[PDB]
Amino acid sequence: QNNNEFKIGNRSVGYNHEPLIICEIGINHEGSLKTAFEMVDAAYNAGAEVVKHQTHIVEDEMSDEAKQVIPGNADVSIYEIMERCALNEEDEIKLKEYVESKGMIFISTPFSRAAALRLQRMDIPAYKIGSGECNNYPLIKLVASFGKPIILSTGMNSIESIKKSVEIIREAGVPYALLHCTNIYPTPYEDVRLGGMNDLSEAFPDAIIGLSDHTLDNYACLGAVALGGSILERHFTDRMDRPGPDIVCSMNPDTFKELKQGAHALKLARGGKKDTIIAGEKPTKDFAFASVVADKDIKKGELLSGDNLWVKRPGNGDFSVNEYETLFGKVAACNIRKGAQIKKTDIE
Amino acid sequence: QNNNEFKIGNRSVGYNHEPLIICEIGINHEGSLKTAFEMVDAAYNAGAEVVKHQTHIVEDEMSDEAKQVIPGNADVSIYEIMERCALNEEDEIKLKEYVESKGMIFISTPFSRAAALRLQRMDIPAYKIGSGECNNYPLIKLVASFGKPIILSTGMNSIESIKKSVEIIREAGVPYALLHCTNIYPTPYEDVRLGGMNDLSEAFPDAIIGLSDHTLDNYACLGAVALGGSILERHFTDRMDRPGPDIVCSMNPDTFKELKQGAHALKLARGGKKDTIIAGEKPTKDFAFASVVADKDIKKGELLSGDNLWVKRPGNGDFSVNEYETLFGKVAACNIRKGAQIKKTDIE
Numbered sequence: 001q002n003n004n005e006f007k008i009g010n011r012s013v014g015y016n017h018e019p020l021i022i023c024e025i026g027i028n029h030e031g032s033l034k035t036a037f038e039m040v041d042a043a044y045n046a047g048a049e050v051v052k053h054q055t056h057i058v059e060d061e062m063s064d065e066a067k068q069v070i071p072g073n074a075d076v077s078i079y080e081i082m083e084r085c086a087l088n089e090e091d092e093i094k095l096k097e098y099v100e101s102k103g104m105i106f107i108s109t110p111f112s113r114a115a116a117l118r119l120q121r122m123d124i125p126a127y128k129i130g131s132g133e134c135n136n137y138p139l140i141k142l143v144a145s146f147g148k149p150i151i152l153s154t155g156m157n158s159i160e161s162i163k164k165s166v167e168i169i170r171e172a173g174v175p176y177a178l179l180h181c182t183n184i185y186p187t188p189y190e191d192v193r194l195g196g197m198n199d200l201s202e203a204f205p206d207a208i209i210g211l212s213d214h215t216l217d218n219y220a221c222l223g224a225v226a227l228g229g230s231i232l233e234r235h236f237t238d239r240m241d242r243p244g245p246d247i248v249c250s251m252n253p254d255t256f257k258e259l260k261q262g263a264h265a266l267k268l269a270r271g272g273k274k275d276t277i278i279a280g281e282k283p284t285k286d287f288a289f290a291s292v293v294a295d296k297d298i299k300k301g302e303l304l305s306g307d308n309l310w311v312k313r314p315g316n317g318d319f320s321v322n323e324y325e326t327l328f329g330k331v332a333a334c335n336i337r338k339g340a341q342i343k344k345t346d347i348e
Numbered sequence: 349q350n351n352n353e354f355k356i357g358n359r360s361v362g363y364n365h366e367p368l369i370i371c372e373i374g375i376n377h378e379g380s381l382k383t384a385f386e387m388v389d390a391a392y393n394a395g396a397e398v399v400k401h402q403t404h405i406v407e408d409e410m411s412d413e414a415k416q417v418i419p420g421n422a423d424v425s426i427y428e429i430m431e432r433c434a435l436n437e438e439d440e441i442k443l444k445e446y447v448e449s450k451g452m453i454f455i456s457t458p459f460s461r462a463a464a465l466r467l468q469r470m471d472i473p474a475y476k477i478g479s480g481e482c483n484n485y486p487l488i489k490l491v492a493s494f495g496k497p498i499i500l501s502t503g504m505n506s507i508e509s510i511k512k513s514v515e516i517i518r519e520a521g522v523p524y525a526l527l528h529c530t531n532i533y534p535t536p537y538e539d540v541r542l543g544g545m546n547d548l549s550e551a552f553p554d555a556i557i558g559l560s561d562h563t564l565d566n567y568a569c570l571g572a573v574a575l576g577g578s579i580l581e582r583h584f585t586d587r588m589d590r591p592g593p594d595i596v597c598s599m600n601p602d603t604f605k606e607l608k609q610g611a612h613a614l615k616l617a618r619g620g621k622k623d624t625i626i627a628g629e630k631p632t633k634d635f636a637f638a639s640v641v642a643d644k645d646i647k648k649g650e651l652l653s654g655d656n657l658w659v660k661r662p663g664n665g666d667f668s669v670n671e672y673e674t675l676f677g678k679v680a681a682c683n684i685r686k687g688a689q690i691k692k693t694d695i696e
């Protein structure tokens with residue numbers, strides 16, 4: 001498919017690498033550092049490599065108008081949700097320390113210029129840009145100036161609109177990933193459009209490609225791996241009974257493990273070429289391919305035809321089924337027994 | 349991807365249709381009609397649509413040489429295995445009746461001219477050609493002359509060698525499917541090469557494409573569906589404790605159900621285009637996209653710049669983040685409050 005790659009800290013990502021699953025804790029902690037640690041514990045214990053946060057600074061993120069608009073997966077204003085769920089700077093730094101104390105990589109999504117500057121102070125190794133900000137070219141400009149790789153979600157945006165984001169990113173000189181995304185919580189299977197991934201890699205041949213997902217299970221992400229996806233993002237919770245607008249579409253430890261196992265299998269199985277000769281098939285070819293045999297007794301001096309020849313397993317005959325018709329007209333050099341393989345010495 | 353389609357009895361197959369899972373009972377019954385019925389029962393009860401048999405007539409299938417060659421997944425000769433497992437004509441007809449008495453479609457793979465003629469007498473609705481016979485052009489010629497659709501496995505064969513089979517098939521005028529296949533029992537993930545499927549559809553634009561699989565689980569088949577596969581073939585047993593060389597890589601009722609559910613999800617999610625506008629995302633765009641706001645108090649008559657402007661959620665401002673730079677140089681038509689959205693009436 002391609003050889004694009006970059007590193008997130010010590011983790012290589014790309015088509016030739018192991019798919020990377022991002023455990024998006026997001027606002028799932030509902031503003032409680034204690035709940036956030038219980039979720040980081042759950043991710044570590046499940047074998048997680050990366051925990052992603054969301055960095056919400058409500059005042060720099062939203063004008064007063066946001067106190068009057070309700071998201072699709074809630075019944076109160078987006079401002080109220082973020083005020084309730086937002087971790088302040090001190091707590092978020094505690095979160096990063098904790099994630100790295102568990103040997104995992106901490107990254108986050110900034111929703112504001114100020115959140116972007118807070119993450120730079122923390123020196124995070126890579127930046128996620130959510131689909132809501134994929135057309136926020138001033139924010140992308142700022143983040144790209146930090147000099148770290150960017151993982152850009154591309155939901156709600158056209159290839160044309162994404163080109164503008166990618167130009168900014170290329171200008172800064174940082175490697176980037178494009179995640180295909182549908183921003184409905186949860187997302188119906190029929191809206192996922194995994195082909196969107198090929199559209200993206202075709203439009204932007206230097207991007208690492210993956211999927212951010214909000215369906216109820218792992219199937220979309222597994223198909224993304226089969227298609228060449230290198231990064232998989234789902235929401236993550238320690239248990240499904242938690243409250244929160246994103247919980248519904250989250251992995252838990254069990255389904256994270258399933259996805260990790262499925263992704264590993266599909267990383268190995270995907271790609272390659274039809275014509276590749278697999279040494280392991282050799283014993284099968286030898287017994288299963290057919291060879292040319294006499295279909296009747298043939299007297300010395302008789303002509304071989306489609307009437308006294310046929311083809312039978314196994315494949316070790318002097319003449320393969322591929323040469324069947326080349327024996328028509330040959331002269332029987334001796335008596336040929338019905339059912340015997342045609343030998344080179346059976347014809348003049 | 350494409351609109352190729354044909355019918356197997358009353359079942360449409362093709363990219364625009366529900367993926368079809370073929371429950372390959374094969375030689376799993378070990379020659380016992382009783383065991384074969386217990387497996388047909390298990391398939392029906394799991395929701396199976398198709399049961400595939402193998403039609404073995406040892407004498408027309410193999411010359412005496414087959415009594416000296418051992419398959420990869422056994423330790424006795426291929427002739428011994430088939431002698432032990434082969435159902436005679438009377439029993440195989442009982443098998444077909446039974447499968448159809450359960451409302452399922454019966455098809456089979458012939459390994460010989462005589463088996464092909466036996467299946468024509470039974471008037472089966474479609475023919476499977478196993479990879480061992482994909483280069484048996486005389487057998488393909490015979491089967492194609494029956495006038496039913498053909499599902500051709502293509503393991504162990506090059507695109508070039510398959511062209512010869514497909515030419516024969518086109519000549520007869522029957523629609524066909526090509527199943528990508530690796531004939532190692534079981535098959536390692538790393539040998540599956542799901543890309544082989546795209547190679548096939550590219551070489552043969554009129555073929556229905558699918559996967560015949562011999563890995564230990566469902567992941568290969570799920571990736572095949574994400575790639576556009578229309579037919580999925582695995583071996584099938586009622587329970588994993590049975591004896592037989594193909595049991596190891598078979599579905600049972602539980603894993604058949606998982607694959608059926610995964611295939612349905614991936615049929616809905618696959619394909620499509622990145623730029624498609626999903627009505628369900630509309631509430632997210634409205635709250636998540638940014639609008640241009642004042643970044644400081646701006647006095648009437650002052651110029652708007654990148655220094656007194658910024659962008660914040662939500663998206664209902666007079667000026668979107670896409671028009672941010674078009675406001676530079678505009679003249680403040682009144683005093684503008686820090687944090688207020690820029691209104692059309694705020695500029696001269």
Ligand SMILES: CC(=O)N[C@@H]([C@@H](O)[C@H](O)[C@H](O)CO)[C@@H](O)C/C(=N\O)C(=O)O
Pocket residue numbers: 026027054071073074081109128129130131132153181183185212245246632636
């Ligand atoms: C549109 C948006 O901002 N959606 C984020 C989500 O948590 C929502 O805030 C909750 O649904 C609020 O109800 C998240 O999906 C964005 C993202 N990538 O798309 C990232 O966090 O990188």
Ligand SMILES: CC(=O)N[C@@H]([C@@H](O)[C@H](O)[C@H](O)CO)[C@@H](O)C/C(=N\O)C(=O)O
Pocket residue numbers: 284288374375402419421422429457476477478479480501529531533560593594
């Ligand atoms: C090479 C071959 O003949 N393989 C068949 C398999 O059952 C073997 O007989 C057992 O492994 C014997 O040990 C089967 O895979 C072929 C097929 N499509 O490939 C079909 O039946 O249509």
